[PDB]
Amino acid sequence: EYLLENPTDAKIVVGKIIDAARAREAARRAREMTRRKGALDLAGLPGKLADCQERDPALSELYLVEGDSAGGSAKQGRNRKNQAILPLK
DNA sequence: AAAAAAAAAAAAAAAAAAAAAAAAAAAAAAAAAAAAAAAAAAAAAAAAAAAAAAAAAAAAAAAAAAAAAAAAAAAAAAAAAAAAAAAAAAAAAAAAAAAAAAAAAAAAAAAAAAAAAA
């Protein structure tokens, strides 16, 4: 409600947050976006991989879990944007 | 004779697959109606042909809507930046014909055995 009411302070805080995010992004090394596994494209990746939607590395994570039961438990609870799970055996 | 790798003991971690039974849907492959398309007959509206004709381009000339000039003002389109869609170029691949190595049948002949004759 406070953000909805006061526009100027909200814009200033958003500007500060964007500046901090850009400063964080400046420290990252150069990288290339990767073809991610999806419904339309699999890219020759394993069937047990539950890949994310983020095409950019440095904003994605791989969780190496012990098995398929833990794999299902982690796949049910995660963030599809970033988290990816590769259940081992 | 030294090095290296497989395999097996037993408590641990973690997975995978084939069928039965009924009822509904979804692919995917066929006969079979159904209409384009094509070959080969007779058949019939159009060009030809000719004579005969009269309706609209020329020509005189006024005048009345006009396209260039002048001005003010609105703002469509073009080129430069970026950001997506969609197609040839090139390289890769799984079955698939070709080749080579091992299992089963074959009889020639003899060792050992079993059996019986006088």
**Rounded distance between C-alpha atoms, residue A65 and residue A83, angstroms:** 12
A4's enclosing H/E stretch is helix A2-5
Which among A76, A53, A50 is positioned nearest to A64, based on CA atoms? Answer: A50
**Rounded distance between C-alpha atoms, residue A68 and residue A40, angstroms:** 24
**Rounded distance between C-alpha atoms, residue A78 and residue A82, angstroms:** 9
CA of A67 to C1' of B27 (A): 36
Q: Is A1 marked as binding a ligand? A: no
- Residue carrying the six token digits 């958003």: A14
**Rounded distance between C-alpha atoms, residue A50 and residue A35, angstroms:** 14
User: What's the Cα-to-Cα distance from A31 to each of A10, A47, A52, A55, A57, rounded to whole Å?
Assistant: 33, 26, 17, 11, 7
- Residue carrying the six token digits 């020759």: A44
A7's enclosing H/E stretch is helix A7-26
Question: Cα A16 to chain center, whole Å?
Answer: 23
Nucleic strand B under 7 Å from the C-beta of A89: yes
Q: Computed over its alpha carbons, how large is the radius of gyration of chain A?
A: 18
Which nucleotide's C1' is closest to A71 (Cα)?
Answer: B14
Nucleic strand B under 7 Å from the C-beta of A70: yes
Q: How many residues does chain A have?
A: 89
**Rounded distance between C-alpha atoms, residue A45 and residue A19, angstroms:** 37
Specify the DSSP class assigned to residue A50. B
**Rounded distance between C-alpha atoms, residue A74 and residue A87, angstroms:** 9
In Å, what resolution does this model reach? 3.0
Chain breaks in chain A (C to N over 2.5 A) after: none
